[PDB]
Symmetry: C3
Subunit: 33 residues, 3 copies
């Protein structure tokens, strides 16, 4: 159970990181995004 | 503990999914969003 | 392991909350954002 939850948490961390990059681009207007 | 963490991770997965939909709409301009 | 995963899940919850605030500001146009 713990090892499987470790994987789900890691997948969440990667998705959050990707969302953070997109939102920062939107709010700062990076490269005209 | 594990069962409670399973619930918190599931709630995170749903919130991330909802954020992903909103951000994709913003960056692609879906339906004029 | 469980205590460390509790911390990673809490960090995710805070990052998701912060993303939610930013995305809602972008989609509603709060304060001209």
């Amino acid at each position: 159970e713990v090892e499987a939850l470790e994987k789900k948490v890691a997948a969440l961390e990667l998705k959050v990181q990707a969302l953070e990059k997109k939102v920062e681009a939107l709010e700062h207007g990076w490269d005209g995004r």
